[PDB]
Amino acid sequence: GALKIGFSQATQQSPFYVALTDAAKAEAQAQGDELFYADANGDITKQNNDVQDLITRGINVLVINPVDPKGVTPSLAAAEAAGIKVVTVDRPVESGAASFVGRDNKAMGELVGKAAVDTLGPDGGKIIEIQGDAGGAVARDRRDGFQAAVSGRPNITIVEGPYCDYIRSKAVTAMQDLLQAHPDLKGVYAQNDDMALGAMQVLAENNRTDVKVFGVDGLMEAVRAIADGDQYVATALNDPDAEGRLAIQTAAKVARGESVPEFVDAGTGLVDKSNASALVGQSTFAAE
């Protein structure tokens, strides 16, 4: 019945968000609906301004990837005053969304952490951790999940590094400071593959291919390195493509007054050597 679907994206500064946007555009068109789209470029005030703009264009429902879980509270208010519902995608809000279309980020962090335990073996070792969004639950859960997997294992220690916002360039900067400060490093866990591969370049420039690398997402470049080398060990699947389709399908139901679950889980799974070969392909991200 031709819906107007609003989509406020948080950023486009890493390939995940670009693919998520593209998948969302294609799903809206496939079901014959109009996608009104804005990218906040990592900026809270731009996001809340963009949401008002979308509301003015008459969206029937708002899909949002919050730049910040409390910073978006004005857009939630604006949505309600407009008589429309809100669907979060990828990053949750505390409350106020009809549905969250995402993944169990703790369980992904746990998945990866178990791969680290197994790989690091009995020597264990120090792991440097490079994180995503400060104050957001996606980063908190990927941290806590990973931690849960190595806790009670004193031969492993974690160095909690900074929040580099899922951006490779920023993780490069952090890996330098951290490499020099912790040369006894045996492992690096980044909360996405984009950042992990930035860390990996810095390691290679300093001849530390011996340091194992752990990520999240199933970025094809990461999957290829897992398949074809020994340094990049594991990641967890976080297909933006499937997430985008589920976000738009879920928003179409909402806009029409249908009941949807509060959490739509777009599914995940471990990528390591044992199965990376089957996931190599042409797209930007691997998928089940």
242-251 per-residue burial string, b: 16 or more CB within 10 A, e: under 16: bbbbbbbbbb
Indicate the domain borders of the chain.
Answer: 1-103+239-266, 104-238+267-288
The Cα 163–Cα 129 span in angstroms is 10
In this structure, what token pair is assigned to residue 234? 């594991």
- For residue 25, report the phi and psi dihedrals to the nearest 5 degrees: -60, -45
Name the CATH code of domain 104-238+267-288 (choices 3.40.50.300, 3.40.50.2300, 3.40.50.1820, 3.30.540.10): 3.40.50.2300
Fold of 1-103+239-266: Rossmann fold (3.40.50)
- Spatial strand order of the sheet with 125-131 comes to 156-163, 125-131, 185-190, 212-214, 232-236, 270-271
Nearest alpha-carbon partner for 101 in 243, 258, 249, 255: 243
SS3 37: strand
- Spatial strand order of the sheet with 263-265 comes to 34-39, 4-9, 61-64, 86-89, 99-102, 263-265
- Method used experimentally: X-ray
Inter-CA distances, 49 with 11, 84, 91, 160, Å: 14, 17, 19, 34
18-46 per-residue burial string, b: 16 or more CB within 10 A, e: under 16: bbbbebbeebbeeeebbbbbbbbebbbee
Name the CA radius of gyration of the chain, rounded: 19
How long a stretch of residues is the chain?
288
**Structural resolution in Å:** 2.3
Identical fold for domains 1-103+239-266 and 104-238+267-288, yes or no, is: yes
Question: Which amino acid appears at position 270 of this protein?
Answer: L
Given a contact cutoff of 8 angstroms between Cβ atoms, the answer to whether 239 and 24 are in contact is no
